[PDB]
Symmetry: C5
Subunit: 103 residues, 5 copies
């Protein structure tokens, strides 16, 4: 298995690592039909989403998607610094594949 | 996908954005039959609800409804400021569709 | 939908509102067979329970019962002030139907 | 329904109350096959477990077992004082049936 | 049942105890397909993973796997010192079987 978020990120196509090194500026969450998602933004202006579960996801990712959203909420509420984000860049806003927190 | 609560709120009928810029004043939770819901109010007295799951909700919203309630509870407890709320105004109290929080 | 806990409480038989205005004094949780419940007490001596799931509950209440217990534990741990409790008084201890929190 | 931990503990055979009046000293959690459990210790020298779910448990105890482990973890992390523990004395280490915390 | 993490760990093949006595330096979580996992690292340079649920795991471990990840995230956020880790050394990074934390 990969040992860092970057090794993991590189195993997928259409992804890139954004080094954030900052807490989340804003947290947005929706329970509206077909837009069950979360959006985060940083002081930098960067904006990312955890996509609505869809046909592209396998069963195993379903539980992971709910965990990622749980993680973003608590990270935001605790003003925890995010290290890096591995995101899919073929989506607007870019989609979160993985996250690392340090410091 | 939409990248802000405003973009998201613009995709639905019967909705509007309320700029709260304040923490939740009170949190109310019910497990009473047919009233399994949450109600929050702000200092202004303005009140909102997360609706009891019903026919107007599609399957993907089931987990989202539960998450929204988890979110309101923890934001109340942490005295976290709510920035805006996208709500359906065809319900009383107005019904929460999305929420944003900012630091 | 009702706008306050008192409004909600009035829709049911065998209920009453207790104005608490205090943090929880003790929290008790049991996983013993047929006694899977939670009991809380206040400096006032007032004791309340979240009942063991049973035939008196409809499907929609199963998740609500679990959430209420989650709320009481975190409310206790954070020393969060409870405003009111809507309880069924046809049980001993009085059974929790809804709770409101405000400082 | 019982109103106190002592009251509840008394309804069962092979159980007894331990007055802890202390925070948990150490917390252990295992996901090893057939040993999916939690072990806690106190400066007193006492060790206790939340048993691996098994044939001795009824269905209604399933969610309760998972809740108890959630409780012990957060109790440990917040250095919350435990009042009493109701345990089955017919297991080694003693098995937790109910817990109480007081302010 | 075992009373300490070392006893427990010894009940399995391909395991060993890593003594940490330090908080988690970084927390990494992935929702990427087939890589739904968590990786943690320490200032020592040691790196560990909670494996993607797989054919080696029995059902009782599935729920336990999700708990371990919940535990690692909150331990990280609270900067709680970890005492020991029982890990499977036939995986890279080594795989977490159990954790222990002490006051
Ligand atoms: O057959 C195996 N038995 N045990 C004993 C308990 C158990 C587990 C599963 C089924 C029945 C009984 C094992 O502990 C065990 C471990 C083992 O290791 C693989 O799985 C673990 C995760 O449990 C981890 O992924 C290791 O790296 C794997 O080798 C294989 C077979 C086992
Ligand atoms: O066929 C694909 N394979 N992988 C490798 C792991 C995997 C995933 C699903 C099935 C079998 C193996 C992919 O990672 C992958 C990704 C992919 O991208 C879409 O889905 C992701 C979310 O997983 C994200 O939404 C992207 O924006 C999408 O393009 C497509 C096919 C893949
Ligand atoms: O999905 C929730 C949403 O459902 C319908 O669209 C209703 O008009 C709204 O008030 C709200 O209940
Ligand atoms: O839904 C729970 C509720 O069910 C009935 O209404 C009972 O009379 C109450 O005591 C309470 O248990
Ligand atoms: O329900 C749990 C309980 O089951 C039986 O009663 C056993 O004797 C106890 O040791 C305990 O395991």
């Amino acid at each position: 298995a990969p040992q860092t978020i970057t090794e993991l990120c590189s195993e997928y196509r259409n992804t890139q690592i954004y080094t954030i090194n900052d807490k989340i500026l804003s947290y947005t969450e929706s329970m509206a039909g077909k837009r069950e998602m979360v959006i985060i933004t940083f002081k930098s202006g960067e904006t990312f989403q955890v996509e609505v579960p869809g046909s592209q996801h396998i069963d195993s990712q379903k539980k992971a998607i709910e965990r990622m959203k749980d993680t973003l909420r608590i990270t935001y509420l605790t003003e925890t610094k995010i290290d890096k984000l591995c995101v899919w860049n073929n989506k607007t806003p870019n989609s979160i594949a993985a996250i690392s927190m340090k410091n």
